[PDB]
């Protein structure tokens, strides 16, 4: 009898394994994967603590909001080289980029010349225009909404932007920063940026993340269906 006795058993084992594998795949395709990025001291820890439910290098945070499972990946200790492991995150649903609004008037404290806002701009420009991230959406969080308001009445925004021309208030100045950050995008036809002004006392950030992720998923499905 061809393919009998132990061989048959072996085949059976393989089949069983295959079944389990398929199951796992069906379980792993229902999770929204987000990549958390920040310039540094940008108030991302508060973001993690906000939507917190349920080693070194990678840090994983699982939570659920309205029958939707989110897995957030944080790379803070990975300081070796971005070019050598960034492509691992090619299939993420979205990139949550955190920027602090209170570091415009304060220097990097190192090199005596780097400005934290300019460093954040450089990081955002590098991440947004990347060969691995061409259709991945970015959710931009602007933290420190209170320190910015408290400091804008004393330190003019021209310290960071020599070409700024306008009033000096909380409004008409955060819009300038948001526009400056959004103008770094060069693929507006295929990519979207969702900007939210996050406050340290605001619990509505999870709602914004959920809305942006649902929009991204719906648009991806429509593109697949040919509408798209």
């Amino acid at each position: 009898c061809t393919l009998s006795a132990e061989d048959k058993a072996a085949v059976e084992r393989s089949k069983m394994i295959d079944r389990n594998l398929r199951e796992d795949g069906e379980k792993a395709a229902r999770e929204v994967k987000l990549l958390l990025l920040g310039a540094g001291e940008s108030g991302k820890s508060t973001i993690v603590k906000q939507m917190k439910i349920i080693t070194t290098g990678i840090v994983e945070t699982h939570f659920t909001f309205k029958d939707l499972h989110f897995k957030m990946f944080d790379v803070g200790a990975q300081r070796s080289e971005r070019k050598k492991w960034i492509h691992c995150f090619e299939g993420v649903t979205a990139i949550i980029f955190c920027v602090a609004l209170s570091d415009y008037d304060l220097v990097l404290a190192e090199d005596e010349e780097m400005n934290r806002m300019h460093e954040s701009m450089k990081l955002f420009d590098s991440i947004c225009n990347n060969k691995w991230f061409t259709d991945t959406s970015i959710i931009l969080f602007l933290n420190k909404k209170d320190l910015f308001e408290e400091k804008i009445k004393k330190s003019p925004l021209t310290i960071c932007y020599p070409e700024y021309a306008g009033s000096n208030t909380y409004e008409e100045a955060a819009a300038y920063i948001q526009c400056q950050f959004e103008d770094l995008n060069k693929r507006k036809d295929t990519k979207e940026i969702y900007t939210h002004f996050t406050c340290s006392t605001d619990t509505k950030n999870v709602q914004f993340v959920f809305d942006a992720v649902t929009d991204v998923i719906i648009k991806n499905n429509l593109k697949d269906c040919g509408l798209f």
């Binding site: 072996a10 085949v11 084992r13 393989s14 394994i17 295959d18 389990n20 594998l21 796992d24 795949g25 792993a28 080693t55 070194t56 290098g57 990678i58 790379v75 200790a77 990975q78 070796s80 080289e81 050598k84 492991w85 691992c88 299939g91």
Partner: protein, 334 residues
């Protein structure tokens, strides 16, 4: 003093360069110009392995020459039987970001690692996580077994380490490199090993003493792969500048450069044959090039992958060649 040390190492570098040049009386191409070319190498896919649901990042054969191990970035480590398609094992990982894979020479253990900076050792003849080594401060790039109780790893913190699985401690640390170490290879006698880093450099380390022996340069970019010649007296390196290079140990210099036009992609892996005549290298164009190691002539081409070639291996008996790819398919060529 700054002057008593600085500006003085350059003198030693100049002396080393002069010594290397003084012994380059001829070239390998001149010696091999009177050798019959191999001809045309034609290999056709014989087995296709399916089951991975994401990119395949590493693979290893094992001295059995029949069983194979593969790792993919979906949290699974699959052990196949090559002669058929049957899966022998499927180990679920605690971390989905894997970059390396190893098969113990005895076939009793397996190793894994990745972005979590931890090397996990699983026992097969018990399936069950046997050990977890965590000393590094960067992503694991490679890991190769020496015995059932010894392992050598390299991390992205510009460091390599020889461990002791019995106690879980770090037996020895190899320092002196500058960039992220991306690959390493063990000599057939397991007394020395070569490591290539992102600083366009390769180094020869002696396991028993933990001291650098020789340093090889010449590449114009990061080095992604490395392989020892079957006789143990030379090795080959592939870098991001779309070129491969052969270095020798006794002469302590470069011998030949395998490069060609219409090739502008980096090399992801390299490997030799049972006799060393051929040199197989996988590229980012989802293909593999087979070069004549003694003539620097492209003897053959292997095509059939869709996204990329990330892992490449040759069995201990030279029967077939296994290639993995970013489309989650492993192919056997004969």
């Amino acid at each position: 003093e700054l002057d008593q040390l600085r500006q003085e190492a350059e003198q030693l570098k100049n002396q080393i360069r002069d010594a290397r040049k003084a012994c380059a009386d001829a070239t390998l191409s001149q010696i091999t110009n009177n050798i019959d070319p191999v001809g045309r190498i034609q290999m056709r896919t014989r087995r296709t392995l399916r089951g991975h649901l994401a990119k395949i990042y590493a693979m290893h054969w094992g001295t059995d020459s029949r069983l194979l191990v593969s790792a993919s970035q979906d949290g699974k480590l699959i052990i196949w039987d090559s002669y058929t398609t049957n899966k022998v094992h499927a180990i679920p990982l605690r971390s989905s970001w894997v970059m390396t894979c190893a098969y113990a020479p005895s076939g009793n253990y397996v190793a894994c690692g990745g972005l979590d900076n931890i090397c996990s050792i699983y026992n097969l003849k018990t399936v069950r996580v046997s050990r977890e080594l965590a000393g590094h401060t960067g992503y694991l790039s490679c890991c190769r077994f020496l015995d059932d109780n010894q392992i050598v790893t390299s991390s992205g913190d510009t460091t390599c380490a020889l461990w002791d699985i019995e106690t879980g401690q770090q037996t020895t640390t190899f320092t002196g490199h500058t960039g992220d170490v991306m690959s390493l290879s063990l000599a057939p006698d397991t007394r020395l090993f070569v490591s290539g880093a992102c600083d366009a450099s390769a180094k020869l380390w002696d396991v028993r003493e933990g001291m650098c022996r020789q340093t090889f340069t010449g590449h114009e970019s990061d080095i992604n792969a490395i392989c020892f010649f079957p006789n143990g007296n030379a090795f080959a390196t592939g870098s991001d500048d779309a070129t491969c290079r052969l270095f020798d140990l006794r002469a302590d210099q470069e011998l030949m450069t395998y490069s060609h036009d219409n090739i502008i992609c980096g090399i992801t892996s390299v490997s030799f044959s049972k006799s060393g005549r051929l040199l197989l290298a996988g590229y980012d164009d989802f293909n593999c090039n087979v070069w004549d190691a003694l003539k620097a002539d492209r003897a053959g081409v292997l095509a059939g992958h869709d996204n990329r070639v990330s892992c490449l291996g040759v069995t201990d008996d030279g029967m077939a060649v296994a290639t993995g790819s970013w489309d989650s398919f492993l192919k056997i060529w004969n």
